[PDB]
Ligand binder design. Structure first.
Ligand SMILES: Cc1cc(C)cc(Oc2nccc(-c3c(-c4ccc(I)cc4)ncn3[C@H]3CCN(CCN)C3)n2)c1
Length: 124
């Protein structure tokens, strides 16, 4: 009973390439993807396989880096702020579902720390 993944392509939306969107894919997404803690965040949470039947009762705005990767590749974002919001939704989803002190929360916290470090280098 997993939900469908978030929408990642819409051929009717307008499309543009910007230095910030390219940076978010080539640098931010790439660096986070290759991080040693990235694996639980590289795809939608599979609540069925993981036996988490309350995940999508608690998390009603799912987000993950596999979805963000597709959105960047498909020029789904017009503004860099949309992509940054998706990353933030992704981390907060982990913090909402879990509790302070859980090992999974430590992984999310490390990735978010790296994410913010790369966002500070965002080009004008
Ligand atoms: C058994 C286990 C442990 C660990 C450390 C990872 C794991 O792999 C996995 N994969 C995908 C998602 C999760 C997950 C998440 C989560 C939520 C939103 C997002 I965006 C990304 C991850 N929150 C908790 N969990 C697991 C971890 C243990 N927890 C059970 C006891 N609390 C369920 N974990 C499996």
């Amino acid at each position: 009973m997993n939900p469908p993944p978030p929408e990642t392509s819409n051929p009717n939306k307008p499309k543009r390439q910007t230095n910030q969107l390219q940076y978010l894919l080539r640098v931010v997404l790439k660096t986070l993807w290759k991080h040693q803690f990235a694996w639980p965040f590289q795809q939608p949470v599979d609540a069925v396989k993981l036996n988490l039947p309350d995940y999508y009762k608690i998390i009603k705005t799912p987000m993950d880096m596999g979805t963000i990767k597709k959105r960047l590749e498909n020029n789904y974002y017009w503004n860099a702020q949309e992509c940054i919001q998706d990353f933030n939704t992704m981390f907060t989803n982990c913090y909402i579902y879990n509790k302070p002190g859980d090992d999974i929360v430590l992984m999310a916290e490390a990735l978010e720390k790296l994410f913010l470090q790369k966002i500070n280098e965002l080009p004008t």
